[PDB]
Structure 1
Amino acid sequence: NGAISLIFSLKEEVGALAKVLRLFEENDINLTHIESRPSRLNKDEYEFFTYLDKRTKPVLGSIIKSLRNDIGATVHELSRDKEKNTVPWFPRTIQELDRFANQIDADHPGFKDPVYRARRKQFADIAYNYRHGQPIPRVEYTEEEKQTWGTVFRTLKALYKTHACYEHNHIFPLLEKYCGFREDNIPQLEDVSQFLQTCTGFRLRPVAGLLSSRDFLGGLAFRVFHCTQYIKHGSKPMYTPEPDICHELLGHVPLFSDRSFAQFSQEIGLASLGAPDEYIEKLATIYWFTVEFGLCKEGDSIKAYGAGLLSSFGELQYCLSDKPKLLPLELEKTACQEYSVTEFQPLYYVAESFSDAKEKVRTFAATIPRPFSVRYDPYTQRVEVLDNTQQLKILADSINSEVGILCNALQ
């Protein structure tokens, strides 16, 4: 089916909303797929959200020209299949992450274990049926699963006070009192999501497996983290090439609980919206060398903040060793650097800070071919698509008002 979406604003005129809503009607598209909301910046405009798929493609082209010239409006055509003259699709609302959440062995250390394979189908099914809004279904984990967690958990906690970054060590005690991070407890995703929610507005979303970098990264734009609920097979408690619950709760969650790290990762996600294939890849590389295997400066020393490092006891000690090569974070080079998932990383990029890395990403995003920019509205949980002079005008007044607050507060 795919997903087609038409992004266009329309000034209110007598009969303006009246006719564009029929412009769908004449072509026979259902008008429960055409949702019309007031523009959030331009007081006199109406923004249209279209929930379409390939069945509607017959008539989309005719509609666009009329809107383009018969009404004089900038129309951006979003398509899932990334075809001639469209922007790669991306959800504009947080509920629209539902639409491909589920869009997802022989050497796995659980290939010949029918209990494990049947267990994995349980978690998959919990994820397949998850929808935005619902609480995350709680699962009692087996005793052998809680020992695997214990094994993973006990060793890593020991290295944190020396190898983990400050943000990580600052938050972890809070997850131990309030979220059941204990050597003997596997935490429930619903408690974690509730905790993140009150910290940075991050929220969890159980996922059956691995999403395409686009889908996964686009979720970061809404501060939605697509999370797995299963656990690695207990035979090899050090296994890491897939992201079990250990990778999630111990590698990602504490940092998603810090504003600057949250704002930084959200920025990688904002940059993915409508990015071409080529640039989703570069963002994935950037992601891999920051959120996944990033190192950060802390005064005169270097600490780890990557999820793949804060979750892998082995490579956490390695990366602080003098053996791995180190480069300062450089996006025009980092985004093109090669990496291998299976082997310990040869190279790590060091970051001045989460804030500085946030700025570099926003800077890098200016290089991403998009006929518009993006800003997340945390009030309606929707993406603002920025392409007008009069929008930037409203944003600038908004900036000016805050400056007045800053100025007045200085006196």
Structure 2
Amino acid sequence: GQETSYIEDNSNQNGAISLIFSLKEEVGALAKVLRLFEENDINLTHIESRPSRLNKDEYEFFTYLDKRTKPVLGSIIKSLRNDIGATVHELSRDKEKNTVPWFPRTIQELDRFANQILDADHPGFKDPVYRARRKQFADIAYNYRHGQPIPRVEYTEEEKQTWGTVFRTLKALYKTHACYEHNHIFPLLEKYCGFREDNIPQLEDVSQFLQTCTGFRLRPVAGLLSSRDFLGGLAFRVFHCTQYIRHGSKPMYTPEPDICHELLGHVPLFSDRSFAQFSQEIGLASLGAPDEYIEKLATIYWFTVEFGLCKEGDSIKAYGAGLLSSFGELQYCLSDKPKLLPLELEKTACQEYSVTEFQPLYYVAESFSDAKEKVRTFAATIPRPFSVRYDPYTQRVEVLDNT
């Protein structure tokens, strides 16, 4: 009702169900559990057992199931609760009564709904060459799987020209408008990632560089993802980003985020430990959060990662990605025209807004570290039967009970 950046999630015909539960070791305990699944016509391939990372005498179970196993899940949970003796949380992509909204527990699980993507008013609409080019990029994303290198693509002189145009203009604004962290990293992206006016950087190169900075990594995505899916990725320090470029007809406009927006507005700040931790905090807070709060986190993300400004002493600079990759609004956000408010999540979370250019008002963050803590605080109010934390060693989410 304003065309916001919030995108409700969708479930496939199979959806996804995950039973979170641990089990203290006992003679025949492990065999009992697995037998319980196996006996219910559940391929033990979707059943994984690992040593608990919290308690040395427990086992953590991971179940990769879907709506197909719904008819038996009930009895299985009852058995676990009453007979075997375990605390179980049911995750469901369909978010039904008594189930927690599904979220990936392992980095590999980001493959599941990575292809769940959202024309006539958009440039390149009636361009066959462009429409074909776009499908090519969408297919690279569709076929992508975690852990794989990101397919390199040779861009056309025309495309590189479109990039050049956007680059030049922004590069001439950064010094005076971009927050310190952005200006700090950019020179490295220029030196080691091919970030030039006459060159479109390859996603693989950018990804490897990011991992080497904050452990952040890219994942080619076909188009827009649901807010839940996209924000959740951040929890794993994974940035779902596009590989295509806007239509060369209008180099200063994009109905959606293209390679120019991703590389110039996002990448620099994801290379900063402070910003990476802050953005990850938003993702961790989205894990299993109710739709109502995903939307609120979506709004918070919009007024921060996308369109946020930050104090730089007595000065105010921009760090929002939608600002750092748009010369027009980058100049406008720091003008005497927009209304500024201090970052306050309870307020920001319910801030009304539209996706059209030149935002009427912006929120100013004290620092990325302050913003992060504010997110942590806000997350505590999000209704979920437990708390989450990311394990960079195993690249798996740790589900500890509410604190």
Q: Give the TM-score range, shorter chain.
A: over 0.9
The alpha carbon displacement at 1:112 in A equals 1.2
What per-residue deviation string (whole Å, max 9, x for no partner) do you get for residues 15-58 of structure 1? 10010010101111000110000000100000000000111111
Equivalent residue number for residue 214 of structure 2: 200
Task: Mark the CA change 1:388 to 1:249 in structure 2 (over 3 Å): closer, same or farther.
Answer: closer
Aligned equivalents of 1:100, 1:25: Cα separation in 2: 26
The alpha carbon displacement at 1:113 in A equals 0.8
Equivalent residue number for residue 75 of structure 2: 62
| Native 8 Å contact 2:193 2:205 kept in 1 | yes
Aligned equivalents of 1:343, 1:203: Cα separation in 2: 28
Task: Mark the CA change 1:371 to 1:382 in structure 2 (over 3 Å): closer, same or farther.
Answer: same
Q: Tell me the SS of whatever aligns to 2:112.
A: helix
Task: Mark the CA change 1:143 to 1:388 in structure 2 (over 3 Å): closer, same or farther.
Answer: closer
| Native 8 Å contact 2:227 2:294 kept in 1 | yes
Equivalent residue number for residue 8 of structure 1: 21
> How many residues end up aligned between the 2 structures?
389
| Native 8 Å contact 2:122 2:255 kept in 1 | no
Equivalent residue number for residue 230 of structure 1: 244
Aligned equivalents of 2:254, 2:40: Cα separation in 1: 52
Q: Tell me the SS of whatever aligns to 1:172.
A: helix
What per-residue deviation string (whole Å, max 9, x for no partner) do you get for residues 211-252 of structure 1? 000000000000000010000001101103310000000000
The reply on whether 1:171 has 2:185 as its aligned counterpart is yes
| Native 8 Å contact 1:2 1:80 kept in 2 | yes
| Native 8 Å contact 1:76 1:87 kept in 2 | yes
| Native 8 Å contact 1:202 1:223 kept in 2 | yes
Aligned equivalents of 1:142, 1:339: Cα separation in 2: 37
| Native 8 Å contact 1:256 1:262 kept in 2 | yes
Give the alignment's TM-score, normalised by structure 1. 0.94
Greater shift, 20-29 or 159-168, is seen at 20-29
Task: Mark the CA change 1:388 to 1:313 in structure 2 (over 3 Å): closer, same or farther.
Answer: closer
The alpha carbon displacement at 1:66 in A equals 1.3
Q: Which runs of no fewer than 5 residues in structure 1 stay unpaired? A: 390-411
Aligned equivalents of 2:164, 2:107: Cα separation in 1: 35
| Native 8 Å contact 2:282 2:297 kept in 1 | yes
What per-residue deviation string (whole Å, max 9, x for no partner) do you get for residues 193-215 of structure 1? 00000000000000000000000
Aligned equivalents of 1:113, 1:341: Cα separation in 2: 25
Equivalent residue number for residue 368 of structure 1: 382
Aligned equivalents of 1:329, 1:42: Cα separation in 2: 39
Q: Tell me the SS of whatever aligns to 2:385.
A: coil
What per-residue deviation string (whole Å, max 9, x for no partner) do you get for residues 364-404 of structure 1? 00010000000100000000001189xxxxxxxxxxxxxxx
| Native 8 Å contact 2:243 2:258 kept in 1 | yes
Aligned equivalents of 2:157, 2:137: Cα separation in 1: 17
Identity of aligned residues (%): 100
Aligned equivalents of 1:306, 1:260: Cα separation in 2: 14
Aligned equivalents of 2:357, 2:272: Cα separation in 1: 29
Equivalent residue number for residue 395 of structure 1: none
| Native 8 Å contact 1:325 1:347 kept in 2 | yes
Equivalent residue number for residue 128 of structure 1: 142
Aligned equivalents of 1:180, 1:28: Cα separation in 2: 53
What per-residue deviation string (whole Å, max 9, x for no partner) do you get for residues 155-186 of structure 1? 00000000000000000000001000000000
| Native 8 Å contact 1:3 1:53 kept in 2 | yes
| Native 8 Å contact 1:241 1:342 kept in 2 | no
Aligned equivalents of 2:24, 2:317: Cα separation in 1: 52
Aligned equivalents of 2:38, 2:208: Cα separation in 1: 42
| Native 8 Å contact 1:9 1:39 kept in 2 | yes
The alpha carbon displacement at 1:342 in A equals 1.7
| Native 8 Å contact 2:178 2:317 kept in 1 | yes
Aligned equivalents of 1:356, 1:145: Cα separation in 2: 39
Task: Mark the CA change 1:7 to 1:154 in structure 2 (over 3 Å): closer, same or farther.
Answer: same
Aligned equivalents of 1:233, 1:241: Cα separation in 2: 10
The alpha carbon displacement at 1:72 in A equals 2.2
The alpha carbon displacement at 1:128 in A equals 0.3
Q: Tell me the SS of whatever aligns to 2:53.
A: coil
Aligned equivalents of 2:141, 2:400: Cα separation in 1: 33
| Native 8 Å contact 1:283 1:335 kept in 2 | yes
Aligned equivalents of 1:272, 1:233: Cα separation in 2: 33
| Native 8 Å contact 2:385 2:402 kept in 1 | no
Aligned equivalents of 1:205, 1:58: Cα separation in 2: 35
What per-residue deviation string (whole Å, max 9, x for no partner) do you get for residues 276-306 of structure 1? 0000000000000000000000011000000
Aligned equivalents of 1:352, 1:342: Cα separation in 2: 26
| Native 8 Å contact 2:329 2:357 kept in 1 | no
| Native 8 Å contact 2:311 2:364 kept in 1 | yes
Aligned equivalents of 1:52, 1:108: Cα separation in 2: 39
Q: Tell me the SS of whatever aligns to 2:148.
A: coil
Equivalent residue number for residue 112 of structure 2: 99
Higher helix share: 1
Q: Tell me the SS of whatever aligns to 1:326.
A: strand
Task: Mark the CA change 1:388 to 1:82 in structure 2 (over 3 Å): closer, same or farther.
Answer: closer
Aligned equivalents of 1:86, 1:121: Cα separation in 2: 36
| Native 8 Å contact 1:241 1:341 kept in 2 | no
Q: Tell me the SS of whatever aligns to 2:223.
A: coil
Aligned equivalents of 1:27, 1:313: Cα separation in 2: 59
Equivalences for residues 243-282 of structure 1 within 5 A: 243-282=257-296
| Native 8 Å contact 2:299 2:349 kept in 1 | yes
Task: Mark the CA change 1:99 to 1:203 in structure 2 (over 3 Å): closer, same or farther.
Answer: same
| Native 8 Å contact 1:240 1:312 kept in 2 | no
Equivalent residue number for residue 49 of structure 2: 36
The reply on whether 1:330 has 2:347 as its aligned counterpart is no
